[PDB]
């Protein structure tokens with residue numbers, strides 16, 4: 001039957017039944033738990049080589065179709081059976097099917113709604129879908145992406161959107177965005193061992209340069225897009241600087257802050273994930289939403305593996321920077337989140353603090369349970385990198401399963417690409 | 420073979436082989452992950468009813484014995500085989516065996532070393548073992564416990580120790596400490612719905628009163644012990660107030676702090692867990708170590724389900740207590756951890772900040788891997804309730820398995836007790 005789940009802060013108990021509809025085996029073994037593994041194969045969907053077997057495509061297809069029409073308040077039996085027949089023919093005749101633009105909008109919000117590591121899923125039904133399935137060239141991809149960045153950025157009033165490029169076929173003509181985020185900074189590795197810019201993109205940065213891009217060697221050089229259409233080699237496209245919106249970080253109290261010289265783009269859009277729906281796969285479909293404070297303040301700026309500015313901020317706060325026990329890091333990182341949240345609102349770019357996010361998620365989780373008796377949640381990712389216990393999510397038990405549709409990771413294109 | 424595991428902050432990768440020696444199935448299913456479930460049956464060892472089958476006792480016994488002698492630098496083949504034979508006879512003849520005091524010391528440190536949710540395991544080999552197996556009465560249990568509290572408290576210079584009361588037998592004459600922590604406060608529920616003291620002990624508190632204890636209705640009334648010897652009903656014993664050491668909390672800056680009227684015992688000792696070694700079970704064996712700041716400051720004082728003083732501390736800090744986005748909680752809880760860490764050191768009681776703890780654990784994890792290619796770690800518990808990302812553990816992948824010996828949870832004695 002169900003799986004009992006409890007929140008220790010409110011004592012409220014829940015029953016998770018939805019997991020019953022999970023696809024394959026997840027990351028965990030019967031006798032061992034690998035829930036802290038970041039990039040597990042259970043969460044990845046790699047390179048295809050031939051069409052996907054009709055035997056398995058048709059089953060999945062019927063599954064989705066049924067799920068779609070099931071979404072409806074008071075169904076359309078006629079319509080439902082009609083499309084059911086209509087899709088089978090197509091598969092039989094063509095080898096694959098196509099989703100009605102509406103079924104794709106449904107597919108994109110469900111895949112989101114089913115993302116265990118997302119804390120903003122309360123917004124799941126507010127998604128702008130840009131159908132670019134008819135696309136055929138890098139030049140065209142680039143245009144669609146510019147349209148998206150402009151729409152999504154909304155002069156600062158962020159809007160959630162996703163651009164759905166062509167579905168995969170034989171897997172030999174895949175559409176891919178070699179980037180990992182539409183807008184992101186470059187990571188260079190100065191001769192003297194030093195790493196300047198964003199260490200997390202050191203490797204991708206290199207490739208870009210290897211593809212003709214000109215390295216401007218600086219902490220905030222926005223990388224160019226690296227588009228791949230119909231499975232051809234990639235082409236490098238510079239984004240119109242007028243389209244990239246950045247926030248200059250400044251502290252509502254510490255004016256010494258500006259001197260740190262810290263800015264950060266205002267649009268968070270993942271460009272390297274695969275949408276899976278009804279047995280179909282779209283290896284290229286960038287999507288955005290808005291930021292949650294901590295993403296920038298705590299992880300981007302403080303991670304030692306990222307911009308690592310936690311000591312500098314402390315020194316400039318005149319803190320016992322050599323006495324771990326003093327809790328100076330707890331002091332630093334917080335003022336830093338204050339700069340980040342204030343620097344966004346000041347300039348009026350949509351931003352969301354982590355206490356509120358953590359809160360809307362419980363509301364969402366409450367709905368998902370009354371709605372469909374279940375909500376795939378990855379506790380490790382859903383809990384903020386700061387304030388753990390201080391947030392309601394922390395005291396909430398969850399179950400983490402992969403349903404369908406879903407947003408999978410993929411393998412670095414430059415790794416599985418026949419040039 | 421091994422399971423690849425990586426730290427994202429240092430990039431250093433590891434191979435976990437030790438998991439191969441895991442006992443039974445853990446909390447997770449092939450297709451679903453229940454890693455955030457607190458009290459899973461995979462981590463619990465309940466009431467026994469008859470002796471444990473010789474068929475399964477002997478196998479486990481040989482297992483441990485072999486493991487013990489294996490601990491030795493340059494083995495004692497003779498001795499090893501001798502004890503191997505010696506134990507089998509005993510089991511054959513008596514129905515169970517007894518551990519040489521030395522094998523028990525080894526058993527207590529390994530069970531600790533194998534506790535996935537412990538962040539201080541670097542200290543695993545420093546454990547004081549108090550052999551009370553010969554015990555037979557509540558009066559005797561009470562004495563042993565007083566000896567332990569006095570030794571462990573060490574006038575403030577905390578010392579790690581464990582008292583091993585009689586092993587289980589037919590399960591009908593079990594030794595149990597109905598408490599959950601040697602020293603702890605009481606939770607009363609004032610007529611007017613109010614809860615005063617420590618909400619977490621509301622239920623246990625009641626029982627105590629139900630057993631004759633006199634409710635002194637106050638935020639810090641230390642509960643009496645509730646001892647059960649040879650499987651008889653429990654008897655209530657007041658702890659000598661001279662043995663309980665408490666720290667009065669005060670802020671090294673905010674003198675308004677004292678007015679909060681906050682103190683907390685200085686000895687953290689779990690009294691309700693079961694030690695499992697060589698197929699044997701000791702349902703009664705309290706053990707202690709010292710505190711990690713956050714345990715008190717973040718969880719005990721702030722949890723809404725505990726003492727919940729996070730708003731009050733903020734008001735008294737003159738913070739935008741009605742603007743979640745202001746990050747006032749991040750501000751509060753930190754100063755509170757500063758009061759807690761400073762109030763302990765001032766009075767000279769051993770305390771440990773969470774950044775250092777999180778650090779020694781990585782060192783430990785590094786050793787456990789070079790030592791035995793594995794370390795059962797429960798990421799969710801090992802990561803602090805504050806400063807998540809700011810600590811090295813956060814960026815460390817881990818595997819969580821139950822080995823042997825091990826410290827299991829048990830079922831509330833008052834639930835499975837034939838009065």
Ligand code: HEM
Nearest residue numbers: 112115117118119120123160287288289290291292295407
């Ligand atoms: C509306 C605002 C949104 C907020 C505030 C939000 C917030 C978050 C946060 C904080 C993460 C953490 C990423 C990291 O730490 O690396 C995340 C991940 C994710 N979100 Fe959302 N999200 C939002 C919208 C969306 C949208 C529009 C989609 C897709 C349609 C989405 C899909 C996901 C997925 C799949 C992940 C997992 C990424 C990964 O595993 O690498 N989110 N989200």
Ligand code: HEM
Nearest residue numbers: 531534536537538539542579706707708709710711714826
């Ligand atoms: C030396 C200092 C030690 C420190 C600083 C330490 C710290 C911790 C912390 C912070 C917890 C978290 C408990 C909670 O959040 O509820 C914990 C749990 C635990 N520790 Fe340690 N520990 C220490 C010593 C020991 C000792 C001496 C033993 C046993 C011989 C031990 C066995 C465990 C076990 C089994 C748990 C799990 C408790 C549970 O699951 O409820 N620890 N420890």
Ligand SMILES: N=C(Nc1ccc(CCNCc2cccc(Cl)c2)cc1)c1cccs1
Nearest residue numbers: 268269270272287288289290291292409410
């Ligand atoms: N708030 C967001 N921020 C955000 C979301 C996803 C990511 C991706 C981070 N994952 C890193 C990673 C590591 C390894 C492989 C892959 Cl595919 C991806 C980053 C910021 C939003 C993203 C999309 C909508 S909102």
Ligand SMILES: N=C(Nc1ccc(CCNCc2cccc(Cl)c2)cc1)c1cccs1
Nearest residue numbers: 687688689691706707708709710711828829
């Ligand atoms: N630092 C410590 N603190 C500490 C350790 C364990 C616990 C137990 C908390 N577990 C709660 C719980 C909940 C449900 C069932 C059981 Cl058995 C136990 C509390 C503080 C030490 C404990 C023992 C040595 S040190």
Ligand SMILES: C[C@H](O)[C@H](O)[C@H]1CNc2nc(N)[nH]c(=O)c2N1
Nearest residue numbers: 036037038380381813814815816
């Ligand atoms: C090892 C562990 O899985 C890893 O550090 C996770 C923890 N939680 C996270 N949570 C979010 N939101 N994002 C991350 O990148 C991570 N990293």
Ligand SMILES: C[C@H](O)[C@H](O)[C@H]1CNc2nc(N)[nH]c(=O)c2N1
Nearest residue numbers: 394395396397455456457799800
């Ligand atoms: C639901 C979740 O497992 C639960 O809140 C856990 C999280 N991590 C924890 N970590 C420690 N050390 N102690 C706890 O009590 C908890 N509670």
Ligand SMILES: [Zn+2]
Nearest residue numbers: 028033447452
């Ligand atoms: Zn798991």
